[PDB]
Amino acid sequence: AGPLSGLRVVELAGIGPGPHAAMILGDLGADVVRIDRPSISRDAMLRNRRIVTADLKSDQGLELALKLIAKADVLIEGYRPGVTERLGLGPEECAKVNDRLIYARMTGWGQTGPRSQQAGHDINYISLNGILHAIGRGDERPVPPLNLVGDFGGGSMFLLVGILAALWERQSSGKGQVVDAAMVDGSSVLIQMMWAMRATGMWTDTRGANMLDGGAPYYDTYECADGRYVAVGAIEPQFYAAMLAGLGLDAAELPPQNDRARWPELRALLTEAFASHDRDHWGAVFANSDACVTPVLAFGEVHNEPHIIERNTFYEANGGWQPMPAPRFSRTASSQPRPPAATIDIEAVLTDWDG
Amino acid sequence: AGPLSGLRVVELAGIGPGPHAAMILGDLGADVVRIDRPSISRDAMLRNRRIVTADLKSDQGLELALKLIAKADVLIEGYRPGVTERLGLGPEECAKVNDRLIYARMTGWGQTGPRSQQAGHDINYISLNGILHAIGRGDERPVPPLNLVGDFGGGSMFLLVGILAALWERQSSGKGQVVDAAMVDGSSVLIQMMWAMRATGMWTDTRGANMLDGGAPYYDTYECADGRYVAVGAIEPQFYAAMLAGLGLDAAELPPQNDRARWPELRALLTEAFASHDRDHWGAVFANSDACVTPVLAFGEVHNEPHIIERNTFYEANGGWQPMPAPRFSRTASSQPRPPAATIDIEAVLTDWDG
Ligand SMILES: CC(=O)/C(C)=C(/[O-])SCCNC(=O)CCNC(=O)[C@H](O)C(C)(C)COP(=O)(O)OP(=O)(O)OC[C@H]1O[C@@H](n2cnc3c(N)ncnc32)[C@H](O)[C@@H]1OP(=O)(O)O
Ligand SMILES: CC(=O)/C(C)=C(/[O-])SCCNC(=O)CCNC(=O)[C@H](O)C(C)(C)COP(=O)(O)OP(=O)(O)OC[C@H]1O[C@@H](n2cnc3c(N)ncnc32)[C@H](O)[C@@H]1OP(=O)(O)O
CATH class of the missing domain: 3.30.1540.10 (formyl-coa transferase, domain 3)
Structure with a gap:
């Protein structure tokens, strides 16, 4: 019911930014299909999904994945660079079946560079670009701002901007392309205000x-x-x-x-x-x-706050409160998110998508 | 040169999330025209813009603004609800001259509700939804994660997702709509992982x-x-x-x-x-x-890190480093940002835009 109704998204199951980006697309009305590995989720992230299973290292699993991708607008993957390539699901292989595809690659370090093959998490990505150093009281070591800045603010949110900007470009060019969303880059743009202030003597490297x-x-x-x-x-x-x-x-x-x-x-x-x-x-x-x-x-008190209640910022779904879709749209309003449902057959999706 | 080449954006000058959203649109190739009040810039955030001035409270200023808006794809405003309405630049007035406009409203509290007319900044918006309470060491009062979570991660980034999603919808509907991006909502979706984990006993309200x-x-x-x-x-x-x-x-x-x-x-x-x-x-x-x-x-040593250097995460501008556009695009790559330039005549833009 939201503005992204009709958009088809294939999500290769990962952790952190990838599933969060896929969630927001689903929130806004997109048709999101998540491919997970062999062996009803209680993870509220993963709402607004259809979940399928495939062994992508097998001949059959690869074939079914490519058939699904051939009918999609967007592919999301969040593995190390080279992983999808070795699977037979790299950008060059996907282009052979779908040159309209927005191939969205979600990483911390990016597709190339000396750290591109290095494992990491949010805290590592924000360590290298000055962000973590700047957070916390001055008389103590830096404190992580949860995983809000790398994974989400500078991660999934930039993947989303890239996906949607590429879709705009496609309206004129007729073609997709590859989006390289690195948390080390996105978080740097997220903190652009501080870089601007530093240049004019309006910010210092002294924490706190x-x-x-x-x-x-x-x-x-x-x-x-x-x-x-x-x-x-x-x-x-x-x-x-x-x-x-x-x-x-x-x-x-x-x-x-x-x-x-x-x-x-x-x-x-x-x-x-x-x-x-x-x-x-x-x-x-x-x-x-x-x-x-x-x-x-505190989280537990939020549901009792009048401004929170009156604007329906949250909804209650088996387990606890969850945030409603953001931002809001006057004409094509997003629906209340559909909860996680049972895993379905991959061929059933192909019949629906005509693939 | 980026994916948003050809997109026309009018930005009504504000602070925090609005200018950051306008920046990213400009970074990715959009044609962004910022209207400031009458009264060169050292502020690196105002990169990738044309700056004009108009007294929006005057007959002439309002007329010129509406002429510009009539030719735009997107309008960004970040004032209190009712401000643009009082000016004669509300959604209903803009719809009369341009029903294809994406009217993007950037606030902290949202368009309605008991707090919607109250002044505030990032720290206030993240205080009300559980986020601020969760940041910092346990034996001390909460510490602000700069203005990264309200203004940017949960603010400008959601405005951008809304704008670009609404543009996707416009291709089939032929019309725009109003985007209501409230930092209190966007930041809640940004921290959805914690709301999900709280429901399954995987996160507690105890700080640190x-x-x-x-x-x-x-x-x-x-x-x-x-x-x-x-x-x-x-x-x-x-x-x-x-x-x-x-x-x-x-x-x-x-x-x-x-x-x-x-x-x-x-x-x-x-x-x-x-x-x-x-x-x-x-x-x-x-x-x-x-x-x-x-x-x-620390910020000052970032430019010496090999991974940062080799990927060109930053560029030099006006004595300091600034982040390059993110995310990255394989076919329609973004250019190095244009520095802030002198204010130009509003009629010169109208000649360019044929309005
Ligand atoms: C969340 C959180 O708490 C925080 C705070 C975060 O920051 S989250 C952000 C974390 N950072 C990032 O996300 C940044 C980017 N990601 C990464 O750097 C890595 O994914 C991490 C480090 C996260 C895990 O490293 P890893 O060594 O465990 O995984 P990998 O090197 O990617 O290889 C995956 C392997 O699985 C296989 N496979 C997958 N699906 C299927 C399938 N359906 N069927 C069959 N097989 C499948 C692939 O073929 C591949 O096999 P190989 O090629 O090795 O033969
Ligand atoms: C920055 C930072 O470090 C941080 C950490 C942040 O979080 S940033 C996030 C901050 N939060 C937000 O951004 C949330 C949303 N914004 C707000 O809540 C407020 O804008 C704040 C509180 C930021 C300023 O309050 P305010 O009382 O100063 O402003 P206002 O109530 O909006 O009214 C503006 C007035 O200016 C007039 N005007 C404008 N342009 C023109 C023109 N060209 N020509 C002529 N006139 C013009 C309008 O007509 C209007 O006049 P009235 O109608 O009163 O007669």
Whole structure:
């Protein structure tokens, strides 16, 4: 029902970014068929799928895969470079049966280069390009921002942009091509703002000492009386003033907002203020204000938040809450995701796809 | 020269996700025209644009904006809901002159709901949906993962997916629609893996006590003899074994990899090992293997890393390095980004676009 209704996607089962990209395509209405190896999933990622099984190293498995690919718009693979090539499913082999195919290759290091054959995970890819070094408090070793930056923000999301951009190009050229989405590249573009700021003296390599990394007292979390937290993001002077107004602090008795030499003094004063009441008290104080103060909610509490409820950001499906499709479309709205279903026959899909 | 060559984009100047989305469209070949308020640029994010100025609150400014929009494929705006409406540039007004327009609305809270009129920044949007609570060490307050997750991973990247998906739909329907990209939604889909794992007992709400948040000794950073860091991401047993081999540790003398009760003991043993030599020594020892051990590089040293150099992940511009376009395309490759140029006349663009 979403904007991608009619789009045919073959997904070769991997981990991390590949399945996340395939999920989003499915969320938006695409017809996604996932090929897994021999031997109902409880993994909520893998919603909006039809799952088939094939031994891609056997003659029969390779034949059935190529027949499926011959009728597809997009192929997603997330193995080491050379893996699909040795299987007989490389770009050159797929082009022989389908030159309209968008061949989307999801890796961390890319298709070539000295590390291209090296195993890795999110934390490794963001280590090499300056990102991981920049995350965390200054007095401690870097902390991983989960796998949000390599696998997803700079990974699957760039694969998706590539797939959809190539599909636009195809409307005029009539032909597909290969998309090389490397997490080391995508995450670098994701953090382009910092590279831009570094060039103009607006960002430093010192961890925890910048405007957006926790270094600024007006852009950080604060612990409240109940041991829970608020987030403060009051960058602009008018928003910062509203924050001080709600705390009841006289600006004339405080250091200037952007006098960095007195930031520890400013932070201590704000720390004392926020610590004087519980988290939910500050929700009441800052209601309908531009102070940029919000409660820091744990996953388990999210479903009780009015703004979350009223916009249906989540749906409840056997097990727990799951995020609804994003972004949203006014005319061709995405459906509530279909849960994981039982594995079906590969020939049944071919009959449906006319292959 | 990239896959989006020929696509016409009008960007109403904002901050954060909007300009980043417009940048990526420009990177991939789109014709992006940014309208700023009247009042050269040092900001590398404004690469691949033509800059014009108009007072959108004046009769003439509004008229010229609508003329430009009448000839565009995409409009990007990142103001509070209602702002474009008040200007006379709302979706209903734009539809009168161009029903093929993809109207892309970039916000934090979304178009409706109790928080939709409140000012905010990245930290606020990720505070409300469980993300911020999950980032950082367990014995301290949450730390912002810069503005990577709300503004970009869960913001601009979802705006881009929406824009390009809506363009795909337009080929068959003949018309555009409104894309509502809210950072609170996009970032929730970005972290879908955690929502999935929470439902199956594979993730907990306790900060710093899980597999991918720094809780696991095989998925974290370690400080070396020189005070610099390595990242370890050796999740799978064969990769973990390769890491132990490189360290010269006897597996029989260590606790099991996934015995969580003995994780502090395991971490202490690995800490002692990594502390015995400098970062670059471990960089050498693990340069080629599948151990998932990488040096943690600061921004300033990224340009000296062989894998970064040989793949041209970055280019030099205005005294500093900037990331090359991502992802990469085999047939319609993106060009090196054009630097920010001087503001040009709005009528010169209309002559070019025939409007
Ligand atoms: C998730 C998470 O926690 C995090 C935090 C992440 O970052 S996730 C991001 C992680 N990084 C990435 O994703 C980056 C890119 N990926 C990689 O670097 C690797 O895939 C990793 C390292 C992930 C696994 O290494 P690996 O050595 O285990 O796998 P491989 O070298 O790719 O070879 C696969 C083999 O399986 C075979 N096969 C497959 N399907 C079928 C089938 N249906 N039928 C039959 N056979 C099949 C292939 O033919 C192939 O066989 P060979 O060619 O060896 O004879
Ligand atoms: C950046 C960063 O470091 C981080 C970490 C981030 O997260 S970034 C993410 C930040 N979050 C978001 O982006 C989320 C969405 N955005 C927002 O919530 C707000 O835009 C913020 C809060 C960012 C600024 O609040 P605000 O009160 O300053 O702005 P506003 O309420 O939107 O109204 C704009 C006004 O400007 C006028 N104008 C514009 N162009 C022209 C023109 N050419 N000619 C003439 N006039 C023009 C409009 O007509 C309008 O006037 P009114 O209608 O009031 O009379």
